[PDB]
């Protein structure tokens, strides 16, 4: 109202906030704009998200007395309507004037304009913005910044999900396309407007008029772009531009694509540059990204996957000339030592792969010989290079050519891995690993073994500093395991002692590996964990001595993880922590995968500490809903045992958790954990009622808000209610009352949805009555306390039962409880009237309907219940 008291006090949420506060936010905030254009505009900057008219209007409007009533539903638009500045149409047109003028470097208005889409979302449509924007776009003062500045509104407008058809705007856009392509721009930014403008207008489909002339312009764009480096990402705009061509090829004839082919040759011709020129060196990195485009350019013609448009494109026919180019492209040589990082280069490798697919005719004759040419004159870099290239060769079986070439490779390759440098062998090891999985015809099992034997023990020295490659060699050994599974017959009976001791060493190495000195490479902690899991899978009947220590190590890791977990560090950490935690879970299930009678008691024993720690920290930390929940699951998976002490420990935390307000919604998580511990012990039921009644009491208020957590709770409470056996009659009366109370409780609508599942809610009430029935005598004179309520219980049920009984959608459980209902209520009610006997057939048809089922079982008992149902006279 004044002094920010309403602006600040009003901010706190209150009942009917959109309706009353909305007058303040939408009308008052909106109200400020007519009096002062400046204050309202000033208003966007301090709290862009916090706009009473829009931000307040937007979420408070979505939930309302009427979920979807225009007169009743939106006050943000009405409130703003009073103030000219506040108006939704004023929002559009004024958003244009203010938003364009006040670019202010990064723009607050753009989000507001985007909200413009969101807030206007309640209204069917807004037509105010286009005429002025169109006029602005065609405005005489065509400033370079202004010409480029326009469309910020257009871009976000394109982004909005709602679809409307505008054509005059499309015509203006076409004019812009021709003029922009036509106009020369010396500043990267203006064309960036061209590119981003295009991609957003590209959308999924284009209503723009057809002509292939503009694309030719793209070809030209490369040449001048050759002269100036600009922005690596500006260049990205060029690469993206062609990529735009990649998405769509409307006319094959139109898309001659001669310029692209010509451009590739010139670029190919300008392979780097003589003497490594700098414009060219930057061009080489950008060229690498562009090269990613290059693979696409090669990919465009003769693609393997089904495509809308497929053609030689003048390249496959020219492949003969282009046959040489793949070998020629090799003009660029790199001596850099990196194993796990690709960046622009991966694109290089994939491009090589596409040529590999497209090799067609003459590839087979060339392949045996190509290796020989490299083999005849192989340099130290070349052999290592030969290995990387061979890795390119991996794709394509080349069966006639490959065996002789591969067979000599075993001999040739073997005199190579013993290179002295720690890094050179590692290079051999990774490429060798890919080959190893790749090749089964050649057999160096004996040849493979010395290195494996050597790798397991000898290659631990280089492990501490950047020893990931030694690990990579280990990964290769794991592949050796897979290859053994799929390479040649048998040979699975030897090397076990070697495996037992080496793996025995691996596991200890892992923890420090995870926190080991950085190589920042394609080495995965998660991947490492997966490798460990695979090794465990390869585990024998017993590896218990390792496992206890392993679990403790995990405990040490958990403590380290907890230290990382307790105080975060800017989120770079947040994620580096989180993924590694996911692997920690991998550890947890992996440790408990095996099960032995002797083993379980021992493992559970030491496990007790861990479980407890989880509870402590899990209850205490309050950081992740599923991580902690998952911890509950894994520790929870420890079925059986003396759970009286542990389970007893669980209830206060469970009761406390329900009481706890850390998470806005905790019902789904709460339901899952209980639905397991609840199952384990039923002999003593004393602990549950105290926390449960409150939780039960707490649930009714909670129930209105969520539909999903209703039937499950109704079913869950039924499960607690499920013991029956003529016990908890007092509780049973309350339980019976609760079902009535649940029916009595007011309906709740969430996300503009109310009672979506008629069956679960309606049936849920059916289940709930039955639950009281098991707890409470299906003969308790005062079955229903209330008179109004009583007619339905007393007389409504019999009439309703005939209709319901003849009714269908009989669930496997509602059907079974009902099966009990027929006999028990039936004997007492037997002889009430001819009508019960007479009205029986309607029930019979539904029972016949119930009969169709999958794997139905136990007719005897149901038959007995029905016998009681018909036990008449």
């Amino acid at each position: 109202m004044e002094l920010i008291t309403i602006l600040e006090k009003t901010v706190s949420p209150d009942r009917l906030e959109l309706e009353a506060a909305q007058k303040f936010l939408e009308r008052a905030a909106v109200e400020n704009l007519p009096t002062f254009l400046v204050e309202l505009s000033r208003v966007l900057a301090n709290p862009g998200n916090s706009q009473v008219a829009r931000v307040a209007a937007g979420l408070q409007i979505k939930n309302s007395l009427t979920s979807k009533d225009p007169d009743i539903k939106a006050q943000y638009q009405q409130r703003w309507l009073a103030i000219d500045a506040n108006a939704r149409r004023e929002v559009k047109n004024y958003v244009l004037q203010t938003l364009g003028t006040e670019t202010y470097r990064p723009s607050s208005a753009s989000q507001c304009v985007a909200g413009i889409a969101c807030a206007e979302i309640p209204v069917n449509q807004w037509p105010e913005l286009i005429p002025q924007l169109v006029a602005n776009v065609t405005n005489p003062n065509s400033t370079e910044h202004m010409k480029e500045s326009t469309l910020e509104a257009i871009g976000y407008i394109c982004q909005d999900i709602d679809p409307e058809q505008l054509q005059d705007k499309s015509n203006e856009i076409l004019t812009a396309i021709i003029q922009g392509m036509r106009k020369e721009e010396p500043s990267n930014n203006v064309k960036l407007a061209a590119t981003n403008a295009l991609l957003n207008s590209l959308e999924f489909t284009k209503a723009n008029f057809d002509k292939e002339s503009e694309r030719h312009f793209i070809m030209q764009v490369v040449c001048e772009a050759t002269q100036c480096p600009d922005t690596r990402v500006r260049v990205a705009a060029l690469q993206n531009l062609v990529k735009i061509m990649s998405l769509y090829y409307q006319y094959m004839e139109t898309y001659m694509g001669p310029a692209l082919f010509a451009i590739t040759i010139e670029a190919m011709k300008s392979d780097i540059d003589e003497v490594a020129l700098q414009g060219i060196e930057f061009w080489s990195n950008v060229c690498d990204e562009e090269m990613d485009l290059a693979i696409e350019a090669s990919e465009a013609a003769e693609q393997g996957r089904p495509p809308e448009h497929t053609s030689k494109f003048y390249a496959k026919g020219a492949l003969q000339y282009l046959v040489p180019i793949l070998t020629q492209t090799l003009t660029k040589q790199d001596e850099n030592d990196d194993d796990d990082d690709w960046n622009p280069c991966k694109a290089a490798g994939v491009c090589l792969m596409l040529l590999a697919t497209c090799c067609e005719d003459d590839i087979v004759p060339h392949v045996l010989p190509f290796i020989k040419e490299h083999i005849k004159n192989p340099d130290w870099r070349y052999r290592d290079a030969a290995v990387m290239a061979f890795g390119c060769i991996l794709e394509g079986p080349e069966p006639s050519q490959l065996k002789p070439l591969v067979i000599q490779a075993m001999p040739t390759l073997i005199e190579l891995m013993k290179d002295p440098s720690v890094v050179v062998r590692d290079t051999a090891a990774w490429t060798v690993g890919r080959i190893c999985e790749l090749l089964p015809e050649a057999a160096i099992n004996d040849v493979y073994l010395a290195p494996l034997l050597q790798c397991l023990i000898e290659g631990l020295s280089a492990e501490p500093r950047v020893a990931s490659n030694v690990c990579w060699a280990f990964s290769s050994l794991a592949e050796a395991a897979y290859e053994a599974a799929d390479v040649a017959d048998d040979q699975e009976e030897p090397a076990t002692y070697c495996l037992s001791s080496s793996f025995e060493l691996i596991v200890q190495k892992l923890l420090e590996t995870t926190d080991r000195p950085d190589g920042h490479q394609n080495n995965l902690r998660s991947s490492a964990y997966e490798s460990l899991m695979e090794i465990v899978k390869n585990s024998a009947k017993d590896c218990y001595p390792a496992v206890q220590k392993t679990t403790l190590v995990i405990m040490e890791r958990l403590q380290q993880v907890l230290q990382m977990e307790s105080h975060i560090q800017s989120t770079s950490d947040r994620i580096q922590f989180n993924d590694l935690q996911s692997l920690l879970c991998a550890t947890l299930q992996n440790v408990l995968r095996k099960v032995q009678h002797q083993d379980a008691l021992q493992i559970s024993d030491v496990v007790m500490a861990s479980l407890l720690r989880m509870f402590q920290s899990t209850a205490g930390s309050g950081g992740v809903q599923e991580d902690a929940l998952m911890a509950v699951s894994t520790l929870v998976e420890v079925l059986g045992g003396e759970f009286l002490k542990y389970m007893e420990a669980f209830k206060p935390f469970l009761g406390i958790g329900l009481k706890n307000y850390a998470e806005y919604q905790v019902c789904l998580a709460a339901v899952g954990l209980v639905g397991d511990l609840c199952r384990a012990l039923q002999s003593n039921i004393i602990p549950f009622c105290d926390e449960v009644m409150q939780l039960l009491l707490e649930n009714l208020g909670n129930e209105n808000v969520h539909r999903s957590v209703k039937p499950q709770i109704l079913s869950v409470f039924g499960d607690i209610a499920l013991a029956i056996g003529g016990e908890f009659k007092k509780y049973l009366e309350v339980v019976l009352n609760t079902l009535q109370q649940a029916s009595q409780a007011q309906v709740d609508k969430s996300d503009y949805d109310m009672v979506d599942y008629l069956n679960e809610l309606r049936e849920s009430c059916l289940e709930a009555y039955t639950g009281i029935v098991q707890g409470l005598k299906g003969d308790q004179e005062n079955v229903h306390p209330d008179v109004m309520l009583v007619q339905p219980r007393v007389e409504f049920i019999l009439s309703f039962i005939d209709h319901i009984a003849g009714d269908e959608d009989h669930t496997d459980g509602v059907v079974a409880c009902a099966a009990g209902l027929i006999g028990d209520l039936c004997t007492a009610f037997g002889k009430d009237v001819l009508k019960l006997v007479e009205a029986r057939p309607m029930i019979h048809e539904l029972l016949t309907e119930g009969r169709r089922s999958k794997t139905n079982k136990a007719k005897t008992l149901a038959t007995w219940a029905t016998k009681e149902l018909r036990k008449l006279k």
Binding site: Q159, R305, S582, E626, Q665, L668, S708
Partner: protein, 74 residues
């Protein structure tokens, strides 16, 4: 109740009749305009993607990890 994270992702992938699936950005901004949202969408959602990968829902297509393009298995 609360919509399942997997559901959201399934709907987003399936809403685009496409082969290469989509850049997470598409699903994420889709979430931004189509659903209730919070500051931790990237961390909790991203981890959710990671977890739906762990459940084996999806097959990789382009990229590596939750930054890429991916397709359903059939």
């Amino acid at each position: 109740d609360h919509p399942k994270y997997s559901d959201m992702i399934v709907a987003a992938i399936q809403a685009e009749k496409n082969r290469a699936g989509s850049s997470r950005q598409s699903i994420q901004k889709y979430i931004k305009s189509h659903y209730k949202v919070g500051e931790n969408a990237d961390s909790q959602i991203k981890l959710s993607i990671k977890r739906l990968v762990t459940t084996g829902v999806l097959k990789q297509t382009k990229g590596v990890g939750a930054s890429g393009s991916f397709r359903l298995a059939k």
